[PDB]
From Swiss-Prot, chain A:
InterPro entries: Ac/propionate_kinase, Aliphatic_acid_kin_short-chain, Aliphatic_acid_kinase_CS, ATPase_NBD. GO terms for cellular component: cytoplasm. ATP binds at K15, H183, L184, G185, N186, G187, D257, F258, R259, G305, I306, G307, E308, H309. The active site is at D123 (proton donor/acceptor). Its EC number is 2.7.2.1. Belongs to the acetokinase family. GO terms for biological process: acetate metabolic process; acetyl-CoA biosynthetic process. It is found in: Cytoplasm. This is Acetate kinase. The gene is ackA. PROSITE patterns: ACETATE_KINASE_1 (PS01075), ACETATE_KINASE_2 (PS01076). It comes from Mycobacterium marinum (strain ATCC BAA-535 / M). The keyword Amino-acid biosynthesis does not apply. It catalyses: acetate + ATP = acetyl phosphate + ADP.
UniProtKB/Swiss-Prot annotation, chain B:
The lineage of its organism: Bacteria, Bacillati, Actinomycetota, Actinomycetes, Mycobacteriales. Substrate binds at R67. NCBIfam families: ackA. It is found in: Cytoplasm. Mg(2+) binds at N8, E360. This is Acetate kinase. The record marks H156, R217 as: Transition state stabilizer. The keyword Cytoplasm applies. GO terms for cellular component: cytoplasm.
């Protein structure tokens, strides 16, 4: 019956999805790409989103706005208005490229749909309460406080969601489990969650830190930027742009997609082989690091596009881990299905799951939370 | 009966040590800090050695060992120095523009004043040359990485190498049979993972700033932090990096780098000191976890260097609550005031834990004599 509209705007894109909270069904789903030839302006992106919804004959309650960065101040699903929107515009320097498109969309959206309330859900919100020892970078304290620099973390809605679904799958209270969640998508991040409360995550001040990703470097010697600047004589924006768009798997092997990368490795391409090896090794390190942080771990869950469907990634990440409590059973891991499932061996002290993520559904239920 | 003078040049300092490699005895040790210049600095050393009735022109010195921070891709063994090799070294300097040129300069001064003896350079990156490609490659643009020679080089190589040998000897097992973690915790700090004697990971990277939280260095840091300080705080690139290297770590978080002084501030209930200490320990525990996973099976973990050798509390807090990863300490063995190579794990710890005093100068002396015979 009741439906929420979840929106997600980039600088040349407006993803959308109509969704029912109480049942979980998704009434419709799209994303208007290349914005900025055929679809020029974000007003004409949401307008063209109505011609799509019309052509399938389209019981609303709210409109959910996906915002990437909530700074120190926004870590709850927040009711929007002109005053709240005001404070949002001030967050933008924390996320200079990612956030303004969602402020833009807040205002184009609320302008063109005053019927329902608009509620904002932040991708940093889940990690607000990371413990100080994990949230603090070891840099000059004054600069850190003045410029609001800490580990904020991202993929918050996904890590939270999956941790709740893992609890349910196992039939135990979220309060009694220690978990690792591995969100392997276009972007990739890891979390450690102790009793439902997050205690580490791999992304940082920005979505660049941590795991190797499609186009992002992840962890990098802090000296690399300076080196490229004073010796290669490249500009800082160029350097950072390269780190977000010309690094990771694209930078190492010339290919993002892991099914394509597989074919390249099957065909004996060394560069694709090295790139895959770099990705897996980086992830293995984060699994180990977070087992230590937790001390005792009950479950590890994979989620997101690569996590849900690449059996070779799951196998290689957790190979040779029996002395740390993890064993996979390939009969379960090698068998493609959708849905929540168990892929660990029956005698594995740590349980390994696949849990499909539904960021848009979790964003819908939170919106109700605020009503 | 025979010795090697081991030298270590900083931007304003000159550490030296005359070591018997067979003996392992240090005939003399010192450090001319403050540096008129390196020509003089080395002159002022000759006098001290004479002030203990030692004259280098006659004492069985077979070699003068020169420590260099960055060996690049091409220098990864002890390297008998001549004018050609020294011309190539100058080309490396942009890979370590602050650490290397000082050592190149002292190589000049020293080859003139001690000509009747071979000069041999040993590189702090050398041990890690052999890191597997999956560990040594940053996930950035290949072309830039290639042309600018950007990879995980690693540092504290002499120490990690030495401690991995000493650990094996201590346990009575050949080094080819052990998987090890070494935690070199000094003013600078780094971790390594060594499989049958070959390093398979280490925490420092292109430069000595990656990895662990240190005395005045940040260690691991979101690359976005630097860009953000540049475009929003509008600080210069050189200033940011200098902050990261000199005004970060424990000094940056607590205003104090010394761990005994830090201990005292913690006992007197200073909250910045306590958060600083927690940040340090949390970062270290992640690395032990990471490197346990890289190795699969780990036989031994060894602490070394100033803090690793002397701070029972750092060792206790690093490895607390790790029984499910195979590690448990024995409180009494850990608190033992006695120095020297020793075991600190419980009898029931599948992973053995050791303290191994490091002696880089001796390791370098022996490397210097490796190149002779």
């Amino acid at each position: 019956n009741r439906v929420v509209l979840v929106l997600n705007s980039g600088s040349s894109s407006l993803k959308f999805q109509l969704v029912e909270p109480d049942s979980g069904m998704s009434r419709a789903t799209g994303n208007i790409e290349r914005i900025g030839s055929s679809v020029p302006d974000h007003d004409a992106a949401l307008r063209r989103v109505f011609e799509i919804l019309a052509e399938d004959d389209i019981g609303l309650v709210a409109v959910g706005h996906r915002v990437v960065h909530g700074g120190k101040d926004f870590y709850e699903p927040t009711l929007l208005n002109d005053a709240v929107i005001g404070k949002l515009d001030e967050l933008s320097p924390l996320a200079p490229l990612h956030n303004p498109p969602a402020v833009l969309c807040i205002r184009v959206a609320r302008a063109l749909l005053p019927d329902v309330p608009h509620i904002a859900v932040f991708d940093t919100a889940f990690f607000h309460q990371l413990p100080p020892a994990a949230a603090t970078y070891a840099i000059d304290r004054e600069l850190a406080d003045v410029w609001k620099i800490r580990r904020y973390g991202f993929h918050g809605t996904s890590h939270e969601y999956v941790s709740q679904q893992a609890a349910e799958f196992l039939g135990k209270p979220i309060g009694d489990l220690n978990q690792i969640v591995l969100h392997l998508g276009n972007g990739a991040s890891a979390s450690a969650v102790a009793g439902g409360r997050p205690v580490e995550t791999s992304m940082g001040l920005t979505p660049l830190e941590g795991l190797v990703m499609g186009t992002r470097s992840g962890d990098l010697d802090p000296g690399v930027i300076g080196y490229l600047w004073r010796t290669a004589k490249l500009g800082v924006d160029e350097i950072e742009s390269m780190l977000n768009h010309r690094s990771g798997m694209l930078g190492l092997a010339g290919e993002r997609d892991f099914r394509r990368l597989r074919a390249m490795i099957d065909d004996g391409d060394p560069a694709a082989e090295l790139a895959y090896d770099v990705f897996i090794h980086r992830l293995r390190k984060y699994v180990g690091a977070y087992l230590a942080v937790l001390g005792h771990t009950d479950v590890v869950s994979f989620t997101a596009g690569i996590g849900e469907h690449d059996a070779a990634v799951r196998r290689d990440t957790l190979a040779g881990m029996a002395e740390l409590g993890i064993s996979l059973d390939e009969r379960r891991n090698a068998c493609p299905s959708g849905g929540a499932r168990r892929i660990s061996a029956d005698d594995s002290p740590v349980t390994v799951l696949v849990i499909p993520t539904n960021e848009e559904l979790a964003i819908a239920r939170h919106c109700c939370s605020v009503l």
